[PDB]
Amino acid sequence: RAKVAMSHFEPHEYIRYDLLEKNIDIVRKRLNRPLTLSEKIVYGHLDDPANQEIERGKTYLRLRPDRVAMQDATAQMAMLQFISSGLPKVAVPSTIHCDHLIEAQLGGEKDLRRAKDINQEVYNFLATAGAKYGVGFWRPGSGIIHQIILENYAYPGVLLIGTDSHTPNGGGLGGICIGVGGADAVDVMAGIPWELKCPKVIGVKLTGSLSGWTSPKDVILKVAGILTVKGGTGAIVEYHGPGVDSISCTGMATICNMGAEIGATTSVFPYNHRMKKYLSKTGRADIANLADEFKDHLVPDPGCHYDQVIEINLSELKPHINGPFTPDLAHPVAEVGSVAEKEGWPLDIRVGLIGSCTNSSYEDMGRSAAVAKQALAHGLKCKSQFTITPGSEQIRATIERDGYAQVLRDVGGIVLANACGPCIGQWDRKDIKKGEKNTIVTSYNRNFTGRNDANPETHAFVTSPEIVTALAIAGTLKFNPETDFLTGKDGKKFKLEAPDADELPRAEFDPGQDTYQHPPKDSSGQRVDVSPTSQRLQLLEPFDKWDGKDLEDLQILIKVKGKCTTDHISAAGPWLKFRGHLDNISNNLLIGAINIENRKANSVRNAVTQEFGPVPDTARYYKQHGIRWVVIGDENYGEGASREHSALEPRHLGGRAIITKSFARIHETNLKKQGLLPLTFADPADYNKIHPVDKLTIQGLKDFAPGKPLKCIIKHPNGTQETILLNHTFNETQIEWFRAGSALNRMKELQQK
Ligand SMILES: [O]/O=C(/[O])[C]([O])[C]([C]C([O])=O)C([O])=O
Numbered sequence: 001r002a003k004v005a006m007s008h009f010e011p012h013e014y015i016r017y018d019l020l021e022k023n024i025d026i027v028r029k030r031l032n033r034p035l036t037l038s039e040k041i042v043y044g045h046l047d048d049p050a051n052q053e054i055e056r057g058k059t060y061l062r063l064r065p066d067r068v069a070m071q072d073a074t075a076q077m078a079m080l081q082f083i084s085s086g087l088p089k090v091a092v093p094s095t096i097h098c099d100h101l102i103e104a105q106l107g108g109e110k111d112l113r114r115a116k117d118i119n120q121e122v123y124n125f126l127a128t129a130g131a132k133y134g135v136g137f138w139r140p141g142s143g144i145i146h147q148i149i150l151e152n153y154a155y156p157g158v159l160l161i162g163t164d165s166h167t168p169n170g171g172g173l174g175g176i177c178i179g180v181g182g183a184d185a186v187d188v189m190a191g192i193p194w195e196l197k198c199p200k201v202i203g204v205k206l207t208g209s210l211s212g213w214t215s216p217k218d219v220i221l222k223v224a225g226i227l228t229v230k231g232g233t234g235a236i237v238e239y240h241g242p243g244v245d246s247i248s249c250t251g252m253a254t255i256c257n258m259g260a261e262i263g264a265t266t267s268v269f270p271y272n273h274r275m276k277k278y279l280s281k282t283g284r285a286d287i288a289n290l291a292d293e294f295k296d297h298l299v300p301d302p303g304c305h306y307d308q309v310i311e312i313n314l315s316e317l318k319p320h321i322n323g324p325f326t327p328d329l330a331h332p333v334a335e336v337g338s339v340a341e342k343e344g345w346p347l348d349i350r351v352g353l354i355g356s357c358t359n360s361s362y363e364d365m366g367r368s369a370a371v372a373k374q375a376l377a378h379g380l381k382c383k384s385q386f387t388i389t390p391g392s393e394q395i396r397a398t399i400e401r402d403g404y405a406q407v408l409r410d411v412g413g414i415v416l417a418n419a420c421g422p423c424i425g426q427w428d429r430k431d432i433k434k435g436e437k438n439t440i441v442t443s444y445n446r447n448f449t450g451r452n453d454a455n456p457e458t459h460a461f462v463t464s465p466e467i468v469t470a471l472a473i474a475g476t477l478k479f480n481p482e483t484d485f486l487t488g489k490d491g492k493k494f495k496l497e498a499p500d501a502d503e504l505p506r507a508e509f510d511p512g513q514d515t516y517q518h519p520p521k522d523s524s525g526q527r528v529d530v531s532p533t534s535q536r537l538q539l540l541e542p543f544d545k546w547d548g549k550d551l552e553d554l555q556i557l558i559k560v561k562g563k564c565t566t567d568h569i570s571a572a573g574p575w576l577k578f579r580g581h582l583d584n585i586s587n588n589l590l591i592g593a594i595n596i597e598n599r600k601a602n603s604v605r606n607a608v609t610q611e612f613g614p615v616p617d618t619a620r621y622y623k624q625h626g627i628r629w630v631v632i633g634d635e636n637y638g639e640g641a642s643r644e645h646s647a648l649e650p651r652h653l654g655g656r657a658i659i660t661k662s663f664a665r666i667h668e669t670n671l672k673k674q675g676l677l678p679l680t681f682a683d684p685a686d687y688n689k690i691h692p693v694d695k696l697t698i699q700g701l702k703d704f705a706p707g708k709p710l711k712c713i714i715k716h717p718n719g720t721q722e723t724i725l726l727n728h729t730f731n732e733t734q735i736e737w738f739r740a741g742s743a744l745n746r747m748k749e750l751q752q753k
């Protein structure tokens, strides 16, 4: 047995490739067919590979992830529920990353110092719960959860789960890294099997070589536009083909990260040479040597069947830019001027922002600085404001040492703390008025409803960092840098050459400042106290147990039109301050959803009083009056971000079922976790038969069984009614979370509590 440790922080926790192969060959003697790469890593982590029913898109796989990662906006509710198990130690290597609460205001040092004082109480809670239950803690300044994971924790054939929808970034180093809600991270930290609907697999055949201004980001901007935000739901994405090798490991992580935007369970690349080189450059040459020894198990089987296959010729791919309000509205940088024209999107760029976990790598900063260098060499600074987020303290230390940070500061860039920042709305934007229509281009992933600054009128376009830099220099979406000229301060016209930069540093990466804090899981001792009077942290009161009766005469709180993402159900930005307090954060419930009745966000009719008002207040008014209610939704309800708050908040305010045409995968699992009923119309045209006024009866809950639809009676005000059927994807363990009131309660009742 090789004794090669998972990371430099867990010397004693070894990679189990032996276990993986054992289970793969068990499964493969039962399936007798080629396995894809995500099927080898996923079925190789099955708790029972000899008896697990394995069928794509149909069965619930009982799995054993190798490790759990949390970030600080979703770690507070995950540790509060983990304290409730009363387990004294986590069962797997687990980390907390403090990246989500640092607000971009004046730039890195100022900002991080501001945030450590602003967020003391929360950072203290998370460090102390981390020391107490054996969770490694990365302090504010460490970096964005996914960078730190790529540099320290992802490896070939890992199964990692993270409480973030962009955990898929770790597929850049051949692991299966899946985003989940905090209650799923609590399963694995408490030792209980994690279940995952068995994934379908989309294969993206890559061909050719990326050239010029075209970078890895453009491969996923292209696949998102092709497949749409709904195209990857319930599937893992597998890249393969000759083109794979032309992409660096952090470029493969960029392509896997924004796979989240098509609803994919996760994305992965096969173990290869550029992965090997990235491991070695990060002090993990030993993991790369063991991976070489099991590479048989870390690449797809010849002839493996993909459910969908898409092909991309990398050498014909052009620079793209997606937006302004969906990540799947794709444009070549070439024609984006004209479309903004036709469609009335602002052509002047207010702010260009490079960073986020999607595009904050050393290679990313290197190509951004290569573009900035040329502009600087002609006496130019940025026309648009320009912000730069480094992905980790190591990348800030190294780009500082290798001079990228001074070039980018010299064209007028502000380099922010190594934190999410403007990406989740942790931004004190001061250059517009609220409501001012404007355009910002970013090298981020998502571009929902100005969610960068809380201005619904901000038009955000996602692109590659080097195109963000050429466009912040030019100030307008009319600039295509592959073909347009700029005028130096010397009155001479020049065109920007395509960037070229080092994938990795020549020397060692400079680690920067000390930000890791290992659990003294020696003595431990110190207790985590949360103030009975905190406005930011509150202990979770157990949700109520099911009374065993039907859901009769349900009031419709809202019938939502169109796109209802978790940023519509539970916004971030000024709400991240309450990610540890459920009653305070429940005050954003669905304030962004569009009411079909009047097509307004946060204006629903209260049915007792007949006044139109805040969706949060109406839900508390129905709860205080004993009126149980339902949300009716459209398609891909709950798209986007991972936050289990979008499911904790409707349960907390009296919610009972969310009936939709379809759900996003993580949100639907979060709804089952919190004792709500996610249900879908057996016929989606029945959405059209429910009017905001109807009362609805969900009958047959005494007979709730796997694969059997429920009856819904739509009670119309004129006394007519009509019965429809509702399908559900509950298996018997999720039906027991329902009966008990939540999965947490089901655990406490199994724990003879
Ligand atoms: O990745 O982005 C976002 O949105 C965030 O990060 C989320 C969670 C929270 O909110 O925190 C997810 O998950 O995704």
Ligand code: SF4
Pocket: 144, 145, 164, 166, 356, 357, 358, 419, 420, 421, 423, 424, 445
């Ligand atoms: S997508 Fe943005 S808010 Fe989510 S982790 Fe990446 S940088 Fe942070």
